[PDB]
Every structure is written in C-alpha cells, then in structure tokens.
Symmetry: D2
Subunit: 97 residues, 4 copies
Amino acid sequence: PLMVKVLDAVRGSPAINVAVHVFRKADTWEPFASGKTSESGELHGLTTEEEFVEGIYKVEIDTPFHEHAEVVFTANRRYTIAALLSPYSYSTTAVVT
Amino acid sequence: PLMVKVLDAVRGSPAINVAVHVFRKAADDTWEPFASGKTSESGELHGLTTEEEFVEGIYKVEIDTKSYWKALGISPFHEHAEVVFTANDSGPRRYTIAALLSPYSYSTTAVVTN
Amino acid sequence: PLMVKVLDAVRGSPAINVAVHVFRKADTWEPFASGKTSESGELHGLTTEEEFVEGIYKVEIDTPFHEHAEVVFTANRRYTIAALLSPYSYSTTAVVT
Amino acid sequence: PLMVKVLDAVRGSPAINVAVHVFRKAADDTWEPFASGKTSESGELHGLTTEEEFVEGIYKVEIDTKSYWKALGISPFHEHAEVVFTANDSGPRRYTIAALLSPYSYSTTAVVTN
C-alpha cells in the first residue's frame, strides 16, 4: 500500500542505498517502517494493508550542504511517495491510485 | 538572514498568507520553536530572525500547505511542505527557502548567499 | 530504449490519454514517434534500439492557462522522460540507466 | 511584461549569465524570434520586450541550460529548458517564467500578474 522511490537529479539515476524512515503520528513520531532504497531507488514491502491504518505519516529520507526531505501526509488506495534529490533542493510527488 | 518565498503552481501566483514555522534542533535532540510568520501578498516572509539569533545549527522549516489549499477549495495530499538543513556551519550565510506548491507535489530549494 | 511517463500534480495520478509527440532533429524537427499515455500515464513502444540512433530529440506533451512541455535532449542505455503537470508549471526528469 | 528568473539547484544560487531565447508563433505556424538576453548576477532577465510589442500570442521560452552546466563542469541531460504558453489572451498580463535547474531535471513555472 506504500512505496517510496528516490531519484538523483544530478546523475539522472535512482538514488541507491539511501536510508528511508517512516513514522506514524502518535503527538510525537513513532517509527513505523524503514529500509534502504534498492538498485532501482525503490523501497517496497514497508507495510501491509492491515497495518497501514488511517493516520498521519512522515517519510524521512536520510542520504558543502546538508539538507533532508520530510514528507508528511494523511493516509487511508495505494501510495507512491517519490522524491527527487539535488544538493540544494528536493521535490516530492505523491501518486495515489 | 532567513526568508521564505512560496509560489502556487495551480494559480500561477505567489502563495499569500501561508503559515510558516521554523524550528531549531537543541543539544538534546528536541526541536525548539525558532520562528514563525505568514507570507505577504508577494508570497514572501521576512523578519523571522536576526543575524545574532540565527546561529549555527540544524533548522526545520515547515510550510503549512494543507490549510492553504483547503482555503482555496483544493484537497491536497501533504500536511505541510518541510525541509531540514544545516545553517551557518561555514560562518554566517543568508538563506532563502523557495517553495513551489501543487496539491500533490512540492519542491523546496535553498538559495544560499555570502 | 525510450519511455515517457506523465503525472498530474493537481490530482496525484497518472495523466491519462495525453498526446505525446517525439521529434528527431534533422535543422528542423521531423516526427519520430507518438502516442497517447496509458492508464498508468505511460507511453512505451515508441521506438526500437535499432532506430533510436544518436541525435537530438524533442518530446512534446500536448494535454484559464495554456502551457506546453517541450523536452529537448541528446540521446545515445535506456531513457525515461518523466513529466509532472500543473496548470502554471511543469517539471521534467530524465532517468538514464 | 516578461521576465525570466533562473535558480541553480546544484549550487543553491541564482543561475548567472544563462542565455534565454524567446519566440512567438506567427500566423503561418513558424516560430519568429521575439527576444533574447542573458540572466544577471541575480539570475534575472528583464527588458526582453515592451507592453506594446508583447501582444496576444503563443510564446516559446528556451533557457540554454546545456551551455550553462558545461561551463560549470557538469554534463547535463537536456539541450535547453523550454516552455510554450499562450500570453495576453485575456488582455495584458505580466509574466515571470521561473526556472529551477538540476543537471537531469528542471521545472518551469509561470507567475502571472494583473
């Protein structure tokens, strides 16, 4: 029900072996799921539909400048959270089907 | 030293009266409130901080986009647009966080000057 | 060797049934390939590796404001041209593997 | 009535001295040269046209990004960043084309004011 795809805007490639942390809003953040992006820049199998209940979720992407993406959304369909990384910028898109 | 500029990609206009919250990471890893405001008619927010108070650290900028879109009659995806970055670790710099907003997508760009 | 994916940033969905025209630089533009995006917002089978030779290509995406994406690049790997559409903005990303 | 602003997402800075070419579609569907210039130290380009000459029509803005990146020591994907749009079909408006550049990605946003 939830997938994450990370792309590298400098190289035009998947961002590989990037640590991704997913949190669910308790109201502090409690760890929900995590992994490292694959060769395709993807992270699948983070959760099941049974455990991916309604609530607020945060996707953190931990890769001369340090910045960090934090994607916060209400969920519950299938969700793809895409992020495109640059040294001084990122973009994120949600595809909900 | 710290400003925020927000554009609306649905209207092709500045995003006006968008709430922005800035936090700074404290030594014990909590987020302390640092500054807040709302964007002007030009989609800009100035006066968040002074050079004295904007010390080296890790800062989190949250742009309250859900409230913005809903007031426009759009049901958006994200709660906020958010970015975390390290500031002033090579001495004082001036930072503009430039955000481009769509209901299901956003970008945040740091424009850093010396 | 060449695929195109179109997304809708207002709806968080594939952009479906959007006409896409591909041109190759002759130096005017001559039609190289075209189609309409599928249910997944994708356009596959535009060309074969044999015919996708080195050169300059242009991908045109024809969907109170009218604007139009034109993505121009030198090719020749596999190329994914992604575009994300908004009423007054678009983004495009190239993933080359 | 027509300005261009360009940011560099690799350097987190304005994109300076980037060539920009604007074209207008003629009645017989050819593209006629309309205006050109280079961005300033602030990444901005003004003075492309006057209100008189910026009539209703379809305009194409090309930002010469390949030359820009290569001078920086980056091998980019695109030849240019390009956008085609209809201008002034509801009477005169002022347009800013705001571009955000990375080697393998860009966005172009029209900020339209009355």
